[PDB]
Amino acid sequence: MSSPVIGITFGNTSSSIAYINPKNDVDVIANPDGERAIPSALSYVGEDEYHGGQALQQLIRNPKNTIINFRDFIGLPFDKCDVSKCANGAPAVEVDGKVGFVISRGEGKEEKLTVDEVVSRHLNRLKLAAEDYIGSAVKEAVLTVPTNFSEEQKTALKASAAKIGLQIVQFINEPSAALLAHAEQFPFEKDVNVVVADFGGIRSDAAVIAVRNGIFTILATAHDLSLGGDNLDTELVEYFASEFQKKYQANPRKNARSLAKLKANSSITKKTLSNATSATISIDSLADGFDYHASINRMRYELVANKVFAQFSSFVDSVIAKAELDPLDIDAVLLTGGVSFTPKLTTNLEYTLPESVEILGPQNKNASNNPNELAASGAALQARLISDYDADELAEALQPVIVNTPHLKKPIGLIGAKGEFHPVLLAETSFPVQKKLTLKQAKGDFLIGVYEGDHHIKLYTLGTKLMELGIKNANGVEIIFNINKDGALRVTARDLKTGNAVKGEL
Amino acid sequence: MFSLPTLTSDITVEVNSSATKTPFVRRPVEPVGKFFLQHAQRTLRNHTWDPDELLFDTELADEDLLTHDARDWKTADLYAAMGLSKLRFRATESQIIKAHRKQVVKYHPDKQSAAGGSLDQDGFFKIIQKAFETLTDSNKRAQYDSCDFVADVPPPKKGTDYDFYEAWGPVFEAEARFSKKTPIPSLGNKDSSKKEVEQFYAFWHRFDSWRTFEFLDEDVPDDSSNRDHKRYIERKNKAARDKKKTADNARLVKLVERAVSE
């Protein structure tokens, strides 16, 4: 038996493990602490080492020896990295031309750790949590990255996993990885265009994916390293400052530990109020020896966060314009990440888009899953498909001659009754491809119009004529557009009852 | 889904220039999806490997069947695809295996790539692939034998002059393959006794047809459906079955009742 293969979503704020059971479904591997999305944090208390939400607990108490958000510093030198992102955690220093961190071990001795060392020992117990649940050793994994990591980072992730003995067998982009599990659980009845939304704690990722006969392709991607759940969190930090200084006449912002425990207890409400209408905060010894008790509902939270949430809908708008699409054309918006649990962010997207876009989120009655989980579950699905392959076959499958498919830029289709353009094979379609349209109610003699199509900001405008075909005294017809590997367009129009078929060739 | 222009000009002439790759674009895609792992596999793996052979088709009897889709395969005739258009239902199980071994080397996709053929013939190969498991299954072949309208010989035309034993001769074996009862009474000749005629029509009046219609299911139960959707398709699919059972049985009754008067 080959080694088990698992999927890794490595995130700024959370990491998750997925694995395909012998019952051939997805199962989420949890940590020993019982939380599925393991946080990406390490805290050293002397010689002892802590991970996860346990390691996030010492951030308020020992912030100089607690590290966080170490995904964006991998593979690139320190001068291209913003140090103030981990200004709340451990300082990031200059180590060997890349980013390193200053830690303190037992007896006050100082150890200088590379960020390459960080990912290895983070994956050390991501290995341990996976093999304890499954009961067998793991050696290889599929790692999901954002699409803006270059190849020199991917080799560094391959190298740092090789420091501990993990073989990163494949790299896949997170919008491509997250969508597959949604497509496996809920297959699409029609070929659609969808937008993957990854709203993390410290960064926001949006990418536009065309779903064409099971092939997932980039139209355009967008990233914002400044928009995220931290801005949701920091807006509440100044919010909780407001009632505290009017009631108790103290400034909680001027103490780092007071601001950290305020930042810690505000971080819980982002998860807590995603499922309930209100949340309560009780903090012993906040600042100047003062306790604090307050209850905050959904509506005043949304009244606070309407500036940031409008930026989140604005970030959706820019990636559509970057690929030059119209929000009438887009079929769905797919959501992943812990920010996507918020029901306010769900409601903004039906308002700022047409009603024909179905927003795939936690609130959806028909197509819903866990947004923090949906990235990793797609990686295990790719893991199961490649589990039959050795390294030679998958690397040959990874070759640019094979992974590059030519597509079709300008869409084709059928002309309507009033001269409107009805696309059959849409835009952005790879070939060879064949689609069937059943005109069952078609009675009489028909002229079948094949035209190229032009799209503008959305009505379809009739474009360049491809061919024309006609049928006589027909009672139900099928229209077939066939494109081969050579780009030749062949159109078959078959009568549904008599079998009288007229074939067009180009 | 909307209406059609419905024009009476009825032209079947292409007027534009040849299809260029200027509206064709070529950036790569991400290696993800189960259909990536098959679309790559056709250009990566592409794995493919006597008195009874005199009964086969030497050349493909339906030339249009080569261009037919693998997805639209249920309207495709598998007997013309297998090379058994002469014999159809009466071919044995080993004959299907020998016919499958003939057609796998004639239409080898690597040899089709060697002969310069397109990938459209590989779509006909997926017809050739799953025809084998359909025709080696006892149920699935019999289900395909239940819908073989090409082998369904019609009764002869009304108002014409014909021999009764020669024109209705091959007709009654078309449903005798659907007989659950053995032995099969024969039509006989002009010198047949009255008791044999009474034993004939009673067999056809009390006829037992095993013909089913699961292959005519346009909607099939998907495994991605929930519990009510697999039930909802089945009652509709049964409603197609018994209607086509009773109508063909009434057609068979009219097949019985016309031969009595003629």
Side-chain angles (χ1 to χ4, degrees), chain A residues 60-370:
Chain A
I60 58 154
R61 179 69 269 168
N62 192 21
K64 297 187 178 185
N65 190 359
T66 302
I67 61 172
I68 193 66
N69 306 336
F70 39 80
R71 199 159 75 114
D72 45 9
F73 322 126
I74 200 73
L76 73 165
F78 181 79
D79 70 319
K80 304 297 176 191
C81 290
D82 187 20
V83 60
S84 79
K85 305 306 212 160
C86 201
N88 315 288
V93 295
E94 181 66 26
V95 175
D96 312 329
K98 299 314 202 330
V99 186
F101 278 74
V102 176
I103 76 160
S104 193
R105 286 293 208 146
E107 309 178 346
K109 64 182 74 67
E110 195 271 321
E111 276 81 351
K112 198 151 310 303
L113 291 185
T114 65
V115 67
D116 296 328
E117 185 70 24
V118 175
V119 176
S120 52
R121 61 182 61 249
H122 198 274
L123 288 170
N124 191 317
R125 323 174 75 160
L126 262 60
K127 170 133 170 183
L128 285 172
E131 67 185 2
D132 289 334
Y133 192 26
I134 299 169
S136 68
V138 300
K139 182 63 70 177
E140 79 282 0
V142 183
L143 177 52
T144 77
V145 298
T147 189
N148 66 336
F149 291 168
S150 64
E151 185 42 49
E152 60 156 19
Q153 292 187 83
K154 281 181 191 167
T155 59
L157 273 295
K158 271 200 296 302
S160 293
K163 301 296 187 292
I164 193 66
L166 274 296
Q167 296 294 321
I168 301 299
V169 65
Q170 199 266 335
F171 279 105
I172 194 65
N173 294 322
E174 280 148 11
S176 47
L179 188 153
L180 175 61
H182 178 87
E184 166 73 9
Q185 189 173 350
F186 310 113
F188 306 115
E189 307 182 344
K190 201 161 92 183
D191 295 67
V192 298
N193 289 333
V194 289
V195 166
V196 183
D198 200 353
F199 302 132
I202 60 151
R203 69 177 282 171
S204 301
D205 269 336
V208 176
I209 298 314
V211 176
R212 311 266 92 87
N213 57 48
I215 309 300
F216 298 156
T217 185
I218 295 297
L219 310 184
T221 74
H223 315 295
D224 204 328
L225 307 182
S226 76
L227 288 183
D230 189 359
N231 320 103
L232 277 296
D233 193 58
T234 312
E235 272 305 355
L236 272 291
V237 175
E238 61 86 20
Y239 175 76
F240 283 51
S242 52
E243 293 83 4
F244 182 76
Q245 67 202 24
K246 63 92 176 179
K247 191 179 177 194
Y248 277 9
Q249 303 305 310
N251 201 340
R253 308 179 208 89
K254 309 310 302 172
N255 189 288
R257 196 201 313 176
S258 87
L259 201 67
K261 65 177 72 67
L262 183 63
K263 230 175 165 178
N265 289 123
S266 178
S267 177
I268 317 296
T269 57
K270 184 184 71 200
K271 294 169 185 183
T272 304
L273 183 62
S274 303
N275 74 12
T277 186
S278 63
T280 64
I281 296 298
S282 184
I283 302 179
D284 302 338
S285 49
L286 183 63
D288 206 1
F290 287 108
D291 306 324
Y292 191 91
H293 311 294
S295 58
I296 295 90
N297 45 44
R298 193 90 60 81
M299 71 66 78
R300 193 168 181 85
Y301 164 75
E302 293 179 354
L303 279 177
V304 162
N306 63 6
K307 275 76 68 177
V308 190
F309 274 130
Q311 291 171 317
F312 271 106
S313 297
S314 302
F315 189 66
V316 176
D317 291 331
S318 85
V319 68
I320 299 298
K322 187 180 172 186
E324 190 275 331
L325 276 297
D326 189 358
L328 183 63
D329 189 359
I330 193 66
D331 291 88
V333 177
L334 202 173
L335 276 74
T336 189
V339 172
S340 293
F341 279 105
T342 310
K344 175 56 173 282
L345 196 145
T346 66
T347 56
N348 296 131
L349 272 295
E350 293 83 4
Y351 166 69
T352 50
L353 290 63
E355 317 262 359
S356 59
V357 189
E358 291 76 10
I359 305 302
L360 313 169
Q363 310 302 315
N364 194 286
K365 206 54 77 166
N366 305 328
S368 187
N369 190 358
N370 298 318

Side-chain angles (χ1 to χ4, degrees), chain A residues 13-16 28-31 35-39 53 271 372-373:
Chain A
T13 47
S14 57
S15 299
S16 52
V28 176
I29 297 169
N31 61 350
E35 162 47 30
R36 321 318 281 289
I38 304 165
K271 294 169 185 183
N372 276 332
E373 195 271 333

Side-chain angles (χ1 to χ4, degrees), chain A residues 380-392:
Chain A
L381 288 166
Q382 282 294 111
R384 196 230 62 68
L385 268 293
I386 72 174
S387 60
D388 294 344
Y389 289 164
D390 55 345
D392 283 334

Side-chain angles (χ1 to χ4, degrees), chain B residues 55-118:
Chain B
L55 303 177
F56 293 160
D57 299 325
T58 317
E59 195 269 331
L60 201 57
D62 187 18
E63 293 84 4
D64 301 337
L65 187 56
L66 182 65
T67 59
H68 280 348
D69 199 1
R71 302 175 183 182
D72 178 38
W73 62 272
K74 301 179 74 65
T75 60
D77 186 75
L78 295 177
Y79 284 131
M82 185 64 72
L84 295 170
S85 72
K86 300 170 191 165
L87 293 176
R88 312 187 73 87
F89 61 94
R90 63 188 149 285
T92 65
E93 281 216 290
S94 60
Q95 185 175 182
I96 297 169
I97 300 161
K98 281 191 308 302
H100 178 246
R101 280 188 291 243
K102 184 175 182 169
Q103 61 185 357
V104 68
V105 294
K106 294 159 50 214
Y107 283 359
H108 202 281
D110 185 42
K111 288 287 188 181
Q112 285 296 324
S113 300
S118 184

